[model samples]
Target: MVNAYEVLKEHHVVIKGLGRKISEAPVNSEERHALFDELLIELDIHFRIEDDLYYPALSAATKLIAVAHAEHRQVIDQLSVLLRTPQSEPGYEDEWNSFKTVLEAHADEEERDMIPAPPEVKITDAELEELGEKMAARMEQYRGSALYKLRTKGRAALVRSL
Candidate 1:
C-alpha cells in the first residue's frame, strides 16, 4: 500500500529538481527553455493530481486545502506570464524569480501542512494508501495520454490571460 504523503513528496522532489535546473541554466538558452517546458508539464500534472484526487480526500473545513488552491492559482498566473515572456526579455528574470518564490513557498506549505493533515482529519492509513494508489494511477494515465498534452496546452493558454 502506498502512502499518500510519500507519493506527493516524491513528486515535489522532482518538481523542485527541475526548478533548480531551470534557474541555473543561462537565460534565453535552449537548455533553459527546454527545462522550463519540462517544469511546466510537471507542474501541470502535479496540480491536477492534487486537485483531482488529493484535495477531495481531505475535509472541506481544512484550511490548508483553501490555501493550497489559492496558491495554485497564483502559481499558474505567474507561470503563464513566464511562458509568454521570453528568457531574453527584461521582465523574464523578475517574473521567474517571483514564480520561484511563490512555488517554493507553496510546496513548503503543502509538505508542512496539507500532506500531513489527513491523519488529523481522521483519514486512516488504509484510506491514505488507497488515495495514493488512485493518485499514482491517475498520474500514469495522464502521462501516457495525448489528451493530457492537449488539456495542458489549453490550460496554459487559459491561464495566460490571468
Candidate 2:
C-alpha cells in the first residue's frame, strides 16, 4: 500500500501519449518534433526516476524492480538508436511507425509483465492521486539537464529530488 497509483497514473499518461502520437505518419511538423522530444524527456528523466527511487521503496521484496529495469533498458536502447540519425532524415516519418510499435511493446511489458504495483500494495486511488501531487513537486525540483548527467557520469548519484 505505498502510493503505487502515483507511478501508475503517470505511466498511463505516457502510454496514451505514445498510443496517439508515435504511430501517426507524416511526422515532420513542429507538432511531431514536440511529440518526439516529449517521448525522450519522459523516458529519459521520469521513468528513470521511478526506477531508481520509488519502485525500490514500494516494491520491497517483489520482482517488480528487476523486470521493470529490463523493460526500461529496452525502451531506452531503442530510443538511443532512433535518436542517432537526424529527425529530418529521410524515411523518418515511416521510422516513427516502428517507434510506435516499440512504444506499444514497452507499454505491454510495463502493465502486463513488469506490473507497476505488487498485488499486496494497498494504497487507495485517492491516496495515489495525492502521492502523484507530491512526486510531481519532487520532479519539478530536479528537472534533468546535460550538466546533471555529466556530473553523475561515473559514480552513482543519490536520488536527489527523485
Candidate 3:
C-alpha cells in the first residue's frame, strides 16, 4: 500500500482487464456500452494520477520512463478518439477495433517492461508512500466530481457483473 508501484500495479490490472472486456464484448450491446463508459472514466482517472504523481516521483532517467510516457499519450489519444465517436456511428466499430489493438500492444509492453523495471528507480519507501498518498488524494478528488459520478456509477457495476 505504501510503495507507489503497488498502487500503480493494481490500477494497471484494472485498466488491462477493462480493455480486454470491452474488446471482447458484444457489439453495440448495453454491456459493451457500460464497459465503455467505465473504461473511459477509469482510464482518465488512472492516467491522471500516474502522470501527475507517480511519474514525477521517480528519480530514474531510464528509457522505460520515456517509453511509458510516450505510450500513455498514445493510448489516451486513442481513447479520446473512441470517446468522441458515438457507438452508433458508422466508424465506431472500426475505431474500437483499432483502439483495442493499440491498447493491448501497449499494455503488453508496459507489463513486460515498465512495471517490472521499477527497481531501476532509486526510491525509498518514504518517497513511494508520499507518491501513493498523492495519487489516492487525486483519485478521491476526481471521484467527488459530478462528471465522474455521471460517467461511472452503474457503468462500473455493470462491468463487474459481467
Candidate 4:
C-alpha cells in the first residue's frame, strides 16, 4: 500500500493552488465568490477524508486524530461565516480574506503533523477507497451548487495562471 503521506501530499497540491487563486483574484465580488467556493469545497473534502477515514485509523494507531478533528471544527466554523455571503453579497472580500488566512494556518499544521504521524499508521485499500469515493461524490455535489458556478468560470481561472 502507498504510504498515507503520499496521498496527503497530492491533496496539498490542490489546497495550496486554491490559496494562490484567492490571492490572485481581483478584489471584486465575482472573483471573491469564485475563490470562496473553491476554498470551501477543498476544505470540505479535506476534512471529510481525514475525519471519516484517515482520522479513525490514525487515532487508533496513535492519538492525533482528536486534536485534528477539533482543528477541522474550528476551521469549518470560520468558513461558515464566510460562506454566509454569496458571490453577489456585500463585503465578500473581507470575509474571504479573513477566513482564508486562518484556514491556511490550519493547513500548515496538517502539513507539519498530520502526514508525518508515526510510521506504524496504515490503512486498507477498501478503507481508502470508501473515503475517496465519498469525497468524489461530494465534489460532484458542489460542482452543481450555486457557488460552483462562480468558481467554474473566471474566479477559478488560476488553473491557467499556473
**lDDT leader:** 1
After superposition, the stretches of candidate 1 with alpha carbons farther than 4 Å from their true spots are: 118-120, 146-162
After superposing candidate 2 on the true structure, give the runs of residues whose Cα lies further than 4 Å from its correct spot. Answer: 1-3, 113-116, 120-133, 144-162
Model 4 quality (TM-score): 0.64
Better of 3 and 4 by TM-score: 3
Candidate 1 lDDT by residue in tens digits, 1-162: 677898899999998899899999999999997787677667767888888888888865477778888989888777766677778888899989889998888789888778786454778789889889989998887554523554566545533423
Q: Candidate order by TM-score, highest to lowest?
A: 1, 3, 2, 4
| Residue 124 accuracy (lDDT) in model 2 | 59
Candidate closest to the true structure, highest TM-score: 1
lDDT of the candidates, in the order given: 0.78, 0.57, 0.70, 0.63
Per-residue lDDT tens digits for candidate 4, residues 63-158, read 566667778777767766765765455787678778777777776877777766545666666666665565555545644552444446543342
Task: RMSD for all candidates, in order, please.
Answer: 2.9, 6.0, 5.7, 7.2
- Candidate 4 lDDT at 88 equals 53
Candidate 4 lDDT (Cα, whole model)? Answer: 0.63
Clashes within 3 Å, all models in order:
0, 3, 0, 0
Kindly report which residue pairs in candidate 2 clash with one another: 1-121, 1-122, 1-123
lDDT of 2 by residue, 26-122 (tens): 4567776656555554555567556655565467536766777676666656655665555678866555556566666766666674444566666
Per residue, candidate 3 scores C-alpha lDDT tens digits across 1-162 of: 556667777777887799788778877889987787777666667766767776666538467778878987787677667657778788888898888877777667866776543666776677777777777778778645524455466543422221
TM-score versus the correct structure, for each prediction: 0.85, 0.65, 0.73, 0.64
